[PDB]
């Protein structure tokens, strides 16, 4: 529980230190979620998954993907942005669009399922700007305190003596751009892959190959984006 236990128990070591400035804020978010349930509203993803992106090593992140907030359908969000469990089908629409662009950009076949854990395991941080949502209500937790947490995560990543490429999908993600200003960091910004915005510049954006060109140009290894 985010209300009950400290960062050193909840997230990976590097992340617990990176997020020290927002320790109280994370506990505050646990209190917010408690109050939601007391009031008769639910949240997604499950409590134990809310901070899941921060359970993969901070020091290993090479690419940052940021979306808006978790999927609003119960059974979709798993705490890694855009990912779904391997048994989920049909895929959410934004994921179908991501995968369409993945095939167009990289030439790989469509993935077998919507599980993005391989990316997380290979140094891609799958973040959302806001880490919870009320079921069926996109953006319902905007402005409730998560933004300070994800801002802190981005500043910390950018302050590392390491290369970073950021992929910011949509307007809420885009508000992290000012924090991504140091010379060790590069940002790719595009419209979000949701059907509402994807035709404004998501399709054709080639984020995966661009990220790899950027990594190689900073002397970093590219991401193996291939999903099974």
Ligand X SMILES: Nc1c[nH]c(=O)[nH]c1=O
Q: Binds 128, which of Cl ion, ligand X, none (CB < 5 to 8 A, cut-off by type)?
A: ligand X
Residue 74 is a binding residue for Cl ion (CB under 5 A): no
Spatial CA neighbour of 69 closest among 136, 149, 141, 165: 141
Residues 135 to 174 in contact with Cl ion, rule: CB under 5 A: 135
Q: Which stretch in 38-46, 88-96, 103-111, 162-170 sits in contact with Cl ion by CB under 5 A?
A: 38-46
Q: Exactly one of 41, 93, 171, 177 binds Cl ion (CB under 5 A); which one?
A: 41
Residue whose token pair is 């089908």: 89
Phi, psi angle pair for 26, to nearest 5°: -65, -45
- The SS3 call for residue 185 is strand
Q: Binds 67, which of ligand X, Cl ion, none (CB < 5 to 8 A, cut-off by type)?
A: ligand X
Minimum CB distance to Cl ion smaller for 41 or for 177: 41
24 among known catalytic residues: no
Minimum CB distance to ligand X smaller for 81 or for 212: 81
Which of the following is catalytic: 24, 59, 69, 100?
69
Contact 203, 100 (CB under 8 A): yes
Minimum CB distance to ligand X smaller for 128 or for 205: 128
Residue 226 is a binding residue for Cl ion (CB under 5 A): no
Contact 124, 63 (CB under 8 A): yes
| Chain contacts with ligand X (rule: CB under 6 A) | 67-71, 81-82, 94, 128, 194
Residue whose token pair is 């997020």: 19
Q: Exactly one of 5, 13, 42, 177 binds Cl ion (CB under 5 A); which one?
A: 42
Could you write out the DSSP letters of every residue in 61-128?
Answer: --EEEEESS--SSTTT--SSTT---TT--SPPHHHHHHHHHHHHHH-PPPPSSS--HHHHHTTEEEEE
Which residues would be at the binding site for Cl ion (CB under 5 A)? 41-42, 135
Catalytic positions are 69
């Amino acid at each position: 529980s985010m209300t009950a236990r400290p960062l050193s128990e909840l997230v990976e070591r590097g992340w617990a230190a990176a997020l020290e400035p927002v320790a109280d804020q994370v506990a505050h978010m646990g209190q917010f979620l408690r109050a939601e349930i007391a009031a008769g509203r639910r949240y997604l993803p499950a409590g134990s998954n809310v901070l899941r992106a921060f359970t993969f090593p901070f020091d290993n992140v090479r690419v940052l993907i940021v979306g808006q907030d978790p999927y609003p359908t119960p059974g979709h969000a798993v705490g890694l942005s855009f990912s779904v469990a391997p048994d989920v089908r049909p895929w959410p629409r934004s994921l179908a669009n991501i995968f369409d662009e993945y095939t167009a950009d990289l030439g790989y076949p469509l993935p077998s399922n919507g599980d993005l854990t391989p990316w997380a395991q290979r140094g891609v941080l799958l973040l959302n700007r806001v880490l919870t949502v009320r079921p069926s209500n996109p953006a319902s937790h905007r402005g409730k305190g998560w933004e300070a947490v994800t801002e802190c995560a981005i500043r910390a990543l950018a302050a590392r003596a390491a290369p970073l490429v950021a992929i910011l999908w949509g307007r809420d993600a885009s508000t992290l751009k000012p924090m991504l200003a140091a010379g060790n960091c590069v940002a790719i910004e595009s419209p979000h892959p949701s059907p509402l915005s994807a035709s404004r510049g998501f399709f054709g954006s080639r984020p995966f190959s661009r990220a790899n060109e950027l990594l190689v140009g900073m002397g970093a290894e590219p991401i193996d984006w291939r999903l099974p």
